[PDB]
């Protein structure tokens, strides 16, 4: 048994938005783990409200940073052969992708996807006695429909043993960060607010056999009947209505299942936001009381797929 880990992150304030008349009301504490939140229609003697997280990130807060803290870890147990997930929650124009992917391509500036290649490879190469098989799958949720980006409209099935899994999603084998990241530029080619994205990677380790999955999701802005699904799943979780969306039946082993599961609830500083970022923030604080109850993977001999 283990909680949901759950994390702040909030972008810069925008020359834009100080020209446009807007204050910053987001403030964190990055030794204590906390975000504060001004209300600026708020009643004098009114208090901001404070939200206490296992870890914050604020505007000064670099990419390398984020990863080898919060998420290299979660990755580690990965290549163990455990389950992982991280997802990114949190009003559009407020960093979910430049968290998940980074906007730019170098080193310093990648996002947790480019970044867990580089991991998940350096550590392979690293490796002695041990041979890995690394496959990735790139999808989208997008009105309930599952669109696969490296191909189309995919069925959910859910058989016995096995478990939730979608139908002929193509899955790509990559000896390479370069390989690896030839999938996911082919798949960002083939895309955004209004949908959601599942990046999957999964490694196979032989040394018999070991078995970890890795979903990486950008959700679609917080502002869709997946995010009020999610929305009610954590609810109860915190009857589990995972069977109301898509998403929810996808990431059903990442909320009260077999993986360990981060969540980085993404903020936006600026007062045009108050109630978007207090929704976020009350999110965020419902998810830490969520217990997962991960185990390590078997894997069978056969695992022969297209
Ligand atoms: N922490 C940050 N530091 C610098 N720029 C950021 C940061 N977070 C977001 N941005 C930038 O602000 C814009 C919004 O980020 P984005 O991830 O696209 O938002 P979302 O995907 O949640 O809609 C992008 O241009 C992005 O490059
Ligand atoms: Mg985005």
């Given at each position: ?17 100080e ?19 001004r ?18 990130y ?8 984020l990863?080898?803290e919060?998420?290299?870890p979660?990755?580690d147990s990965?290549?163990?052969g ?17 968290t998940?992917?980074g906007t ?11 970044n ?7 550590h ?9 098989l ?13 669109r ?24 790509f084998?990559?000896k390479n ?5 030839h999938?996911?530029n082919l ?14 990677i ?25 995010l009020?699904?999610?929305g009610?799943?954590?609810?109860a ?7 109301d969306s ?13 993986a ?8 936006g ?5 108050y109630?978007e ?15 997962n ?11 022969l797929?297209?």
């Amino acid at each position: 048994s283990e909680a949901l880990k759950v994390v702040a992150r909030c972008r810069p304030l925008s020359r834009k938005e100080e020209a446009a008349g807007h204050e910053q009301i987001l403030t964190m504490d990055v030794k204590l783990g906390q975000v504060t939140l001004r209300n600026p229609r708020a009643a004098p003697g009114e208090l901001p409200k404070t939200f206490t997280f296992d870890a914050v990130y604020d505007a000064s807060s670099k990419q390398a940073d984020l990863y080898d803290e919060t998420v290299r870890p979660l990755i580690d147990s990965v290549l163990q052969g455990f389950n992982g997930t991280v997802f990114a929650y949190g009003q559009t124009g407020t960093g979910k992708t430049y968290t998940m992917q980074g906007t730019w391509v170098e080193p310093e500036l990648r996002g947790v996807i480019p970044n867990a290649f580089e991991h998940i490879f350096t550590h392979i190469s690293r490796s002695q006695n041990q041979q890995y098989l690394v496959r990735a799958s790139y999808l989208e949720i997008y009105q309930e429909e599952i669109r696969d980006l490296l191909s189309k409209r995919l069925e959910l099935k859910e058989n016995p043993e096995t478990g939730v899994y979608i139908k002929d999603l193509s899955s790509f084998v990559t000896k390479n960060v370069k390989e690896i990241e030839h999938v996911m530029n082919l798949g960002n080619q083939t895309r955004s607010s209004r949908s959601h994205a599942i990046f999957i990677i999964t490694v196979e380790c032989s040394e018999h056999i070991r078995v970890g999955k890795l979903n990486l999701v950008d959700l679609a802005g917080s502002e869709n009947l997946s995010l009020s699904a999610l929305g009610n799943v954590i609810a109860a979780l915190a009857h589990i209505p995972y069977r109301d969306s898509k998403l929810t039946r996808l990431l059903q082993d990442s909320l009260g299942g077999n993986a360990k599961t981060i969540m980085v609830a993404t903020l936006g500083p600026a007062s045009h936001s108050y109630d978007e970022s207090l929704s976020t923030l009350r999110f965020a604080n419902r998810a830490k009381n969520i217990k997962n109850k991960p185990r390590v993977n078997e894997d069978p001999k056969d695992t022969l797929l297209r």
